[PDB]
Amino acid sequence: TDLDENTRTVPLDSSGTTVILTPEQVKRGKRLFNSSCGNCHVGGITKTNPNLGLEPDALSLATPARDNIDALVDYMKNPTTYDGLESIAELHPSVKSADIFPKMRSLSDEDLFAIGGHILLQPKLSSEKWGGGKIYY
Amino acid sequence: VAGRDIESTGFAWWSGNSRLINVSGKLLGAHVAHAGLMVFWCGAMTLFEVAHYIPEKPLYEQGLILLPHLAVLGWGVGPGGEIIDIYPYFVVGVLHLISSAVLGFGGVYHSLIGPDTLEESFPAFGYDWRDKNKITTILGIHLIVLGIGAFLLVIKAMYVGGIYDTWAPGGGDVRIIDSPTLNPGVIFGYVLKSPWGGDGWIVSVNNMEDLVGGHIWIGIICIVGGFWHIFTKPFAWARRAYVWSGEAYLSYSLVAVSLMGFIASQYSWYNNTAYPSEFYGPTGPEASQSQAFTFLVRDQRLGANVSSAQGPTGLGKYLMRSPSGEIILGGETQRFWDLRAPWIEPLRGPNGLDLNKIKNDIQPWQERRAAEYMTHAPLGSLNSVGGVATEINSVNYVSPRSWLTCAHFFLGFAFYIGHLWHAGRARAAAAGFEKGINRENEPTLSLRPID
Amino acid sequence: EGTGEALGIDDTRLIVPVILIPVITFILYAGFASEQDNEDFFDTYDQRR
Amino acid sequence: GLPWYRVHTVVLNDPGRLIAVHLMHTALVAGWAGSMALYELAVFDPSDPVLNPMWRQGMFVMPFMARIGVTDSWGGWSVTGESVANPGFWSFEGVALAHIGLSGLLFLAAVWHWVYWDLELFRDPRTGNPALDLPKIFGIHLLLSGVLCFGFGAFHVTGAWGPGIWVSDAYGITGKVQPVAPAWGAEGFNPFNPSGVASHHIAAGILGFLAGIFHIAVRPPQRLYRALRMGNIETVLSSSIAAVFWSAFITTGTMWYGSATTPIELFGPTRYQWDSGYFQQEIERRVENSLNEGLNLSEAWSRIPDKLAFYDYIGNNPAKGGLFRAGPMNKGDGIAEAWLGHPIFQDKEGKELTVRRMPAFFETFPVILVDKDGIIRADIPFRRAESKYSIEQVGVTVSFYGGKLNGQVFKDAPTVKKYARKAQLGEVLEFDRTTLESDGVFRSSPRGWYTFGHANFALLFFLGHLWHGSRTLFRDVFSGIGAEVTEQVEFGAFQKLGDRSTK
Amino acid sequence: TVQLPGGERVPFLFTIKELEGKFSSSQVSAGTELGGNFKTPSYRTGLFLDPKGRGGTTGYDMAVALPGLEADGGEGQDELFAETNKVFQVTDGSIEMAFNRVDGTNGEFSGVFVSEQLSDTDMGSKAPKKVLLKGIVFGKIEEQTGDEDY
Amino acid sequence: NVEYPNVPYLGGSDIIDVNNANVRVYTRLPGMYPAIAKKIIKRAPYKDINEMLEKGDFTAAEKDILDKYLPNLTALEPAPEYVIDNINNGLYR
Numbered sequence A: 001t002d003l004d005e006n007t008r009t010v011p012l013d014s015s016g017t018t019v020i021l022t023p024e025q026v027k028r029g030k031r032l033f034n035s036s037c038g039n040c041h042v043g044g045i046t047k048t049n050p051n052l053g054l055e056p057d058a059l060s061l062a063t064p065a066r067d068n069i070d071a072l073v074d075y076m077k078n079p080t081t082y083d084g085l086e087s088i089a090e091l092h093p094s095v096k097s098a099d100i101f102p103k104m105r106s107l108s109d110e111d112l113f114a115i116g117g118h119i120l121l122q123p124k125l126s127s128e129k130w131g132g133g134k135i136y137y
Numbered sequence B: 001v002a003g004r005d006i007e008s009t010g011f012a013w014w015s016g017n018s019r020l021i022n023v024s025g026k027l028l029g030a031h032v033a034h035a036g037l038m039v040f041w042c043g044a045m046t047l048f049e050v051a052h053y054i055p056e057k058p059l060y061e062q063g064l065i066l067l068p069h070l071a072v073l074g075w076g077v078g079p080g081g082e083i084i085d086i087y088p089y090f091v092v093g094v095l096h097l098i099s100s101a102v103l104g105f106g107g108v109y110h111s112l113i114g115p116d117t118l119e120e121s122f123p124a125f126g127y128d129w130r131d132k133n134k135i136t137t138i139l140g141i142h143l144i145v146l147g148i149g150a151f152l153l154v155i156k157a158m159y160v161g162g163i164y165d166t167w168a169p170g171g172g173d174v175r176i177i178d179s180p181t182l183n184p185g186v187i188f189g190y191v192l193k194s195p196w197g198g199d200g201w202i203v204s205v206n207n208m209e210d211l212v213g214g215h216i217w218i219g220i221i222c223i224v225g226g227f228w229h230i231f232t233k234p235f236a237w238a239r240r241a242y243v244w245s246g247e248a249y250l251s252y253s254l255v256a257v258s259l260m261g262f263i264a265s266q267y268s269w270y271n272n273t274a275y276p277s278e279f280y281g282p283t284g285p286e287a288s289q290s291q292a293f294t295f296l297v298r299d300q301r302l303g304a305n306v307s308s309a310q311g312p313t314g315l316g317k318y319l320m321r322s323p324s325g326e327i328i329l330g331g332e333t334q335r336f337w338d339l340r341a342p343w344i345e346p347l348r349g350p351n352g353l354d355l356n357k358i359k360n361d362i363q364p365w366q367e368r369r370a371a372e373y374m375t376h377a378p379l380g381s382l383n384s385v386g387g388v389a390t391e392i393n394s395v396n397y398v399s400p401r402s403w404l405t406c407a408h409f410f411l412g413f414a415f416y417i418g419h420l421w422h423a424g425r426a427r428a429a430a431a432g433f434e435k436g437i438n439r440e441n442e443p444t445l446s447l448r449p450i451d
Numbered sequence C: 001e002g003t004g005e006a007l008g009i010d011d012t013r014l015i016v017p018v019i020l021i022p023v024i025t026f027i028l029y030a031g032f033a034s035e036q037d038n039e040d041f042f043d044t045y046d047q048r049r
Numbered sequence D: 001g002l003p004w005y006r007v008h009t010v011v012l013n014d015p016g017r018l019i020a021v022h023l024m025h026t027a028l029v030a031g032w033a034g035s036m037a038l039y040e041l042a043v044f045d046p047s048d049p050v051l052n053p054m055w056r057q058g059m060f061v062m063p064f065m066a067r068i069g070v071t072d073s074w075g076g077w078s079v080t081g082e083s084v085a086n087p088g089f090w091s092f093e094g095v096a097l098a099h100i101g102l103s104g105l106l107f108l109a110a111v112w113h114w115v116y117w118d119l120e121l122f123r124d125p126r127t128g129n130p131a132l133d134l135p136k137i138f139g140i141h142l143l144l145s146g147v148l149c150f151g152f153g154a155f156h157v158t159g160a161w162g163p164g165i166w167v168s169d170a171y172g173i174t175g176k177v178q179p180v181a182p183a184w185g186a187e188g189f190n191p192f193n194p195s196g197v198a199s200h201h202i203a204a205g206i207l208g209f210l211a212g213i214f215h216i217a218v219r220p221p222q223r224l225y226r227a228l229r230m231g232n233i234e235t236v237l238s239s240s241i242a243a244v245f246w247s248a249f250i251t252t253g254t255m256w257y258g259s260a261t262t263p264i265e266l267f268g269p270t271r272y273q274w275d276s277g278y279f280q281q282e283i284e285r286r287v288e289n290s291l292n293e294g295l296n297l298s299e300a301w302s303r304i305p306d307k308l309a310f311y312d313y314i315g316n317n318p319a320k321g322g323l324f325r326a327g328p329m330n331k332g333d334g335i336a337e338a339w340l341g342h343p344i345f346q347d348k349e350g351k352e353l354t355v356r357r358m359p360a361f362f363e364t365f366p367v368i369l370v371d372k373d374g375i376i377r378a379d380i381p382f383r384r385a386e387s388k389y390s391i392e393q394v395g396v397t398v399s400f401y402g403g404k405l406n407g408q409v410f411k412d413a414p415t416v417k418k419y420a421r422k423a424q425l426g427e428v429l430e431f432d433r434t435t436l437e438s439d440g441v442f443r444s445s446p447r448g449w450y451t452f453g454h455a456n457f458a459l460l461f462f463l464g465h466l467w468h469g470s471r472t473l474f475r476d477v478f479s480g481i482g483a484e485v486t487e488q489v490e491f492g493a494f495q496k497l498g499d500r501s502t503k
Numbered sequence E: 001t002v003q004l005p006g007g008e009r010v011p012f013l014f015t016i017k018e019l020e021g022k023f024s025s026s027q028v029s030a031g032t033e034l035g036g037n038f039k040t041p042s043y044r045t046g047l048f049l050d051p052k053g054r055g056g057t058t059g060y061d062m063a064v065a066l067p068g069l070e071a072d073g074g075e076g077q078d079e080l081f082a083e084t085n086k087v088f089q090v091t092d093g094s095i096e097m098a099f100n101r102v103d104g105t106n107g108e109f110s111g112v113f114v115s116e117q118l119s120d121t122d123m124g125s126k127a128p129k130k131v132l133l134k135g136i137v138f139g140k141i142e143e144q145t146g147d148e149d150y
Numbered sequence F: 001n002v003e004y005p006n007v008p009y010l011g012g013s014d015i016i017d018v019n020n021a022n023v024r025v026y027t028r029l030p031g032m033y034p035a036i037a038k039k040i041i042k043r044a045p046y047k048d049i050n051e052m053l054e055k056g057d058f059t060a061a062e063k064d065i066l067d068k069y070l071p072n073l074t075a076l077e078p079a080p081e082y083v084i085d086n087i088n089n090g091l092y093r
């Protein structure tokens, strides 16, 4: 099947609103994800802390829930622990910590939007590959 | 056509350069043109790296191999090994590229229109391969030149800007090496150290004082030896122990250069002082110890007592004892317990990793460095898919250490093969049976039968 | 192991063989060498033994 | 002199001595047949034919006796299971002794032909040299082959003056030696129709007989005589090896895939009966029509014969043994004693789980209990931590129906797991592992061993056919090439290769 | 791990884990002795897998390399239950440290100890052997800082 | 151990056995993984969930989270083979 709009529609906000990503947006999101965070987050996993992956189950059960574009984009600038009680900006790539993480310095709001779109688009592409790990390679 | 065909020389086109052995001027042109090739590649490649360099990523993640050398020499890099300016790299590139034009003109001149043999028009430069004194004078001149190069590195490290010390107090930084170690027991203590684990021979340089002081020693040695060879002739023990032909000299240079290739490959693989991990990326030992460090910090943060945690086999999951008793990171990093890097020494006491520092005083920057070096291990494919062989195609990355080590190990083995070929041929041609066995006087038929 | 001794020589005893055995071999080789015609030659190798 | 690999070439041009060596080889083969029969009878256990048949005991050569009539023993037992009251001479023992006696007589004939070799029968009247009129000898032998084929088809297999042949039902439950009427028509070419054997052996034999009358009467054309080197016996050797490996491949195929000439109760089932669930489907339809008759699971499964349940078991598969796991099939899993019945797996609620069966390819297969539609429901985990489909979590009970363990409802998790491991291998049985000291690794049936041996022999005899065809067609250049080769082999010297009249 | 006369190898986990030592006084000095019992965990944990992929917390629950042995409906592989059933068993030991030197300036003390425990059981397959260790001890006594989080 | 009847409560079911469950299982229950689970596993052996709430030293917000997820939590007999691997069992992804 084509990259239809049904695949390209991803949740935007916590209420339930959706947004249809453009092909340029998903292309840029894939490139930015592979360049800025693929080293640890290849395949929707976390190499440094595999307890917390990027699969939709983990993002949905995060506090705040990270299964939407606004929540993901806020995480890319105000990262926190899985329960949302401690700031981990000094240990996580964030646009507010780009001097110590020189890959986040060039990202704009649209870049963060595209990266979140890539993250939310992936699980629709595969039933278990995104965040599945070795078992589904 | 004379001197350039099989009929008048006995060498085919594919052994074409073998027709240059006794043609001194044309051979000089060959050498100078090839040196022009070398400097051309240096300038062109470092300009290519400057053009493809993006200021976001570090050098080791971008596939850059040459700009790390200039950064180590102390150009355009600030504290923490952050490349702040890349204009000196451009200057070095353009200088090499422009000098390549001069060297190429000289080589093409001497190859095509220059005198064929220098032994009648320029007796000072002309030579015979069998004239030991003149060849030794040439060798001594080149030794003096090499000593001048070593002293150029010394001058750069001591006076002109200084070099990048990754072990510097605070973070790694460009600093003047004011007090190199000139003690013979240290410099030649490195040379006589073993190559095995923990010793490392000359790959185990852990400070720039030893490096600069031993480069002073190399400069003094080379200049003294060059003046020795200019004013001396080979002794009788040497005169009977070598084949005095051009191919023999080539084979000697080939074996030496092959050994250097192997040593340089292991320098790039294991050393992280002359090849700082912030320019060339983590070593394999560094990446493994970084994985162990990251998961130690994670599990300690989650309530585990890492010192008392038991792995599956009874050994430490995070911390154990080395075979000599030092407290070391556990798991399969136990083999890499000889790693010493500026980001992990801070937690190291006399008896190994200090448990108090490991428990209470691991800084966030150490965790960041460990995560970065874990995710950027030397593992990768020929098509540059970073990670283990069973990884997926999302990360495009092979460490510069892997490239340099593999390339120079390859070339070292290849040049050992070249040495074997050329040394055997030199011996056979000197003895005079490099073309075949004489049907008239076959040595085997004169030999008494065995058994 | 991993201590960095020059040539692995941790005991001073190890040097006695390491220096003397080459010296006895050198002494035996010198009797051969002194018997040779040690003048220079213009050839790829010496055919005189 | 004559190197070790050419030693049997001295008898190449000595027809009497050739007959002698052929006689000695025939004597050795007949003696092997007799001795193998005697050893098998010594080690055979005729007590239990349904759970310890011939093919479970490693009986290689006895099924070939039982295939075409010899189903009885002088000891008062039969492979069919019945007790013989008055066995005839032609039992297993009588066949073995007859083969030994024939071996001795053939040995004596070999001795006579070796000593008395210079007979006028072997000398050409025209030239006086020793020779063999191979095209006419072939016609005589083809007459003999046709007569024997027709006699076997018309008298032995049809039982007009013979026992008949082994015939069995679709599932190897009721099989016996009986006559088969010839199946003339297309049905005779069904490989699983035993009647097609008779139709073959009659008709083919007749044609063979007619062919003999041709070859004795009609001399070869000169063109084929010079092309095939009919005056060279090594032509006959090459062609015979060719036909022999052809037959070996065909027999290997009919053995592995099965046919009417390889009954399962004589050689065990095939791998494909296990792969397609051939016996599982039959057992299922039997119990289904029993249930439709008003019976319950216990009664329905009790009506399934033990032999049919024994066929539905992976250990009987020929594709489970090993190259160096040697001996009877009983030396592996053991001697089957009884059938414990069908283990229905009632989950915690009551849904029927089923353990996925081991494919023959896998030495070790995970124990997973798929649902009716087949979504995985329960399994035996490798990693117990974070286990979703453990039998403990889901909850399973094993209710046995049929067999000796009938009407028993185990509902603990351990005992459920133990019988899940058994149900992975098909039907569950009890085994004696002490009589033969069995080591618990599966072996191959006689079907698999026949297939292995004859496949390898067929390939090696293809090599032999290549070698001897090469020799007979290149006899003139055996010792090496002469000087004539240098002129013809030049490029463009002759318009036609080899021929020198051209240019 | 150690090797005995005859060439038999005994692995053991020399440990004082979960020790409950009792001082022989209200003040540590030369002649004071600290002693008590401790619980030694298993040499191998549950995650350890034997050469045939069998463990406590994971692994096969059968001898997979003998499917014909598991084919039997009567007993199956019940004979190999002792080797297949991996059991994490925590053993007991005792230690008696005797302090022969003590310092009040640094809080440091040193002396000798004798400890008794049991060796590796291979998850219950082996029978444990008693191990008697003797040696030297160092230690220090300080004031609780409140950040130890014991 | 070819039999361990408390496997379902090791992280694969809706109920979690606190005494011998890995930290990773608390990722299933929102708001408990990094902070609450650390204190759950610190004083791991509990007679029951009530003794866990009394003994765990939880702050008021942590107690509120635990009140939310009480029916998902239990405390069975501690298993040494599983307690030793309660923070890192080698199960990563």
Ligand code: CLA
Pocket: B003, B004, B005, B012, B013, B014, B015, B016, B017, B018, B019, B020, B023, B026, B027, B029, B030, B031, B033, B034, B037, B101, B104, B105, B108, B111, B112
């Ligand atoms: C590093 C590479 C290298 C170098 C430096 C040389 C150099 C040389 N080779 Mg060559 N050679 C090489 C590789 C190389 N070779 C290889 C790979 C092969 C195998 C095919 C050969 C096969 C070979 C044979 C068979 C022979 C030589 C010979 C020679 C010598 C004489 C050339 C001559 O008169 O040709 C004349 C060539 C030409 C007129 C063609 C034009 C070539 C132009 C000058 C190249 C342009 C270069 C550059 C763009 C100019 C820049 C100018 C500057 C001002 C900017 C010369 C010293 C000859 C020799 O030994 O003579 C005694 C000889 O017979 N070579």
Ligand code: CLA
Pocket: B028, B032, B102, B103, B105, B106, B107, B109, B114, B115, B118, B122, B125
């Ligand atoms: C391996 C290098 C090499 C060698 C051994 C030779 C050898 C020779 N060349 Mg030369 N040549 C070379 C490279 C080389 N060349 C190059 C690179 C070029 C291209 C520019 C030329 C171009 C060239 C030409 C065009 C001619 C020769 C000729 C000659 C011959 C005479 C040299 C002479 O009179 O010197 C005299 C020396 C000088 C004039 C140099 C003076 C020094 C100046 C001022 C530079 C100072 C540099 C400074 C010290 C460096 C500081 C270093 C610091 C950065 C650390 C001789 C056989 C001649 C020949 O064969 O005629 C038939 C000839 O006509 N060569």
Ligand code: CLA
Pocket: B136, B139, B143, B191, B192, B221, B222, B223, B224, B225, B226, B228, B229, B232, B233, B234, B235, B238, B259
């Ligand atoms: C490019 C470098 C170079 C080259 C090609 C030569 C070539 C020569 N030198 Mg030497 N020489 C050089 C540099 C060089 N020298 C320098 C810089 C010095 C110091 C001043 C000397 C001092 C010197 C003297 C005093 C003499 C020579 C002599 C000789 C001749 C004999 C060489 C021999 O048999 O060595 C034999 C080598 C050995 C027996 C072993 C070397 C000992 C070192 C310390 C080994 C240490 C171990 C090492 C680290 C192991 C690992 C190495 C690894 C790379 C494989 C020959 C013409 C002889 C001659 O006839 O002069 C007129 C002579 O007597 N040279």
Ligand code: CLA
Pocket: B041, B065, B066, B069, B073, B149, B150, B152, B153, B155, B156, B160, B257, B258, B260, B261, B262, B264, B265, B267, B268, B404, B405, B408, B411, B412, B415
């Ligand atoms: C395709 C050919 C090829 C290419 C492209 C390269 C490329 C490279 N090699 Mg080389 N190499 C090759 C073939 C090749 N090699 C072969 C066949 C061998 C033999 C086996 C080697 C053996 C070899 C070794 C032994 C080493 C390299 C290394 C290198 C790297 C650095 C080059 C350098 O600076 O050298 C050195 C350059 C020179 C000798 C030229 C003169 C340098 C002067 C004296 C420096 C002056 C410095 C001073 C501070 C300047 C300022 C002065 C003043 C203002 C104060 C580079 C990636 C190095 C590396 O990183 O290895 C891991 C290294 O150590 N190579």
Ligand code: CLA
Pocket: B013, B014, B015, B016, B017, B018, B250, B254, B413, B414, B415, B416, B417, B418, B419, B421, B425
């Ligand atoms: C310092 C470097 C050096 C120098 C100056 C020379 C010089 C010479 N070599 Mg060479 N040689 C070298 C390194 C060197 N060699 C090495 C490292 C090897 C080992 C691989 C060889 C192997 C070698 C052989 C086998 C022969 C020579 C010969 C010669 C002479 C003629 C070569 C020619 O005209 O080629 C012209 C160039 C070409 C035809 C281009 C060929 C390009 C090839 C096909 C590409 C590489 C293929 C493959 C990847 C190599 C794998 C190598 C393996 C060990 C890993 C000349 C004196 C020949 C001779 O007559 O000696 C007296 C000769 O027979 N050399």
Ligand code: CLA
Pocket: D183, D184, D185, D187, D188, D189, D190, D191, D192, D196, D197, D199, D200, D203, D204, D205, D207, D208, D245, D246, D249, D250, D254, D259
């Ligand atoms: C109406 C009379 C009649 C009837 C009913 C039959 C019935 C039969 N004939 Mg036929 N037959 C008859 C007359 C009759 N024949 C006559 C008059 C002749 C002439 C003498 C023959 C000659 C004849 C031959 C030569 C063969 C049969 C065979 C058969 C059987 C076919 C079914 C079967 O099992 O095939 C199974 C066998 C096949 C389907 C033949 C396979 C042929 C392929 C091409 C072989 C390929 C081999 C090759 C080397 C492999 C390379 C690759 C590999 C290594 C991977 C069956 C019993 C076949 C047989 O004996 O089967 C056991 C057989 O081969 N018949």
Ligand code: CLA
Pocket: D040, D043, D057, D058, D059, D060, D323, D324, D325, D326, D327, D328, D445, D446, D449, D450, D451, D453, D454
């Ligand atoms: C192709 C013909 C054939 C076939 C299919 C079978 C089939 C069978 N025979 Mg065998 N058997 C045959 C010929 C055949 N036999 C012959 C000619 C003899 C007389 C020697 C025997 C004697 C015999 C006996 C005594 C017994 C069997 C038994 C069996 C059964 C088990 C087979 C086994 O374990 O193999 C195991 C085979 C191997 C371990 C080796 C196979 C792999 C290759 C061929 C090895 C080649 C090695 C090579 C020559 C190099 C050796 C080097 C040397 C220096 C050591 C099986 C039904 C057993 C049975 O159940 O009887 C009731 C039994 O006890 N057979």
Ligand code: CLA
Pocket: D004, D005, D006, D007, D008, D009, D237, D241, D460, D461, D462, D463, D464, D465, D467, D471
């Ligand atoms: C029935 C078929 C048959 C017949 C009649 C012959 C006959 C002959 N072959 Mg043989 N050959 C055959 C099949 C046959 N071959 C096959 C299938 C192959 C392929 C492997 C060969 C390959 C072959 C070669 C390559 C050569 C011969 C040669 C010969 C001649 C001399 C052999 C000799 O003296 O060996 C003497 C043999 C020995 C002293 C010991 C052999 C021991 C063997 C290897 C192992 C044990 C065998 C075992 C006891 C019985 C096998 C059972 C059977 C069911 C396979 C002779 C005319 C030779 C020839 O042409 O000479 C002019 C020759 O060089 N043959």
Ligand SMILES: CC1=CCCC(C)(C)[C@H]1/C=C/C(C)=C/C=C/C(C)=C/C=C/C=C(C)/C=C/C=C(C)/C=C/C1=C(C)CCCC1(C)C
Pocket: B033, B034, B036, B037, B040, B047, B094, B097, B098, B100, B101, B102, B103, B104, B105, B107, B108, B111
């Ligand atoms: C000034 C500036 C600003 C921005 C960047 C920019 C790059 C544009 C830069 C410009 C740089 C420029 C224009 C650099 C010029 C460099 C030039 C022309 C270099 C040329 C070097 C010449 C070389 C090697 C010659 C070597 C030739 C050889 C062995 C020939 C070999 C051969 C010979 C001798 C005989 C037989 C045949 C064979 C084998 C081919």
Ligand SMILES: CC1=CCCC(C)(C)[C@H]1/C=C/C(C)=C/C=C/C(C)=C/C=C/C=C(C)/C=C/C=C(C)/C=C/C1=C(C)CCCC1(C)C
Pocket: D028, D029, D030, D031, D032, D035, D100, D101, D102, D103, D104, D105, D107, D108
């Ligand atoms: C080595 C090898 C390679 C490949 C196959 C295999 C792995 C199986 C293995 C074995 C191969 C082979 C070819 C084995 C074959 C064995 C053979 C041919 C054994 C021979 C058995 C023959 C016997 C007893 C004959 C008995 C004869 C007797 C009393 C005769 C006596 C008599 C005589 C002589 C005169 C008349 C009266 C009377 C009493 C009948």
Ligand SMILES: CC1=CCCC(C)(C)[C@H]1/C=C/C(C)=C/C=C/C(C)=C/C=C/C=C(C)/C=C/C=C(C)/C=C\C1=C(C)CCCC1(C)C
Pocket: B186, B187, B188, B190, B191, B202, B205, B210, B211, B214, B215, B217, B218, B241, B242
């Ligand atoms: C520069 C630098 C950087 C980092 C810190 C460090 C301290 C290492 C510092 C100093 C480094 C130093 C001082 C390095 C010096 C290296 C040395 C002296 C290496 C020695 C190499 C010598 C070699 C192969 C000798 C081999 C000679 C041979 C077979 C001669 C020939 C022969 C002989 C002897 C007998 C048999 C026949 C044959 C084959 C003709």
